[PDB]
């Protein structure tokens, strides 16, 4: 699966950082979910293995990483 900037995807939380949560979308696709981009869910309540529905903000090939945004449209 490939990821486009602005499309809707579900991902799984790998680890909780003090500045966000790293989430995998696909075998070679991982990104970062930041707290100010979160609506109903806070980093403080997220656990390793939780499936979170997010929208892709920026997909940067040069960086191989993606920004995630939390939406009430789950």
Swiss-Prot record:
Q: Which residues of the full protein are shown?
A: 131 to 202 of 761
Name the UniProt record assigns to this protein? Uncharacterized protein MJ1198
| Highest taxon, organism lineage | Archaea
Q: Where is the S1 motif domain?
A: 6-71
């Amino acid at each position: 699966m490939d990821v486009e900037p602005g499309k809707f995807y579900k991902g799984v939380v790998t680890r909780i950082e003090k500045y966000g949560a790293f989430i995998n979308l696909n075998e070679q696709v991982r990104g970062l979910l930041r707290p100010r981009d979160m609506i109903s869910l806070r980093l403080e309540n997220l656990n390793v293995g939780d499936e979170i529905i997010v929208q892709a903000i920026d997909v940067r090939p040069e960086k191989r990483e993606i920004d995630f945004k939390y939406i009430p449209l789950e």
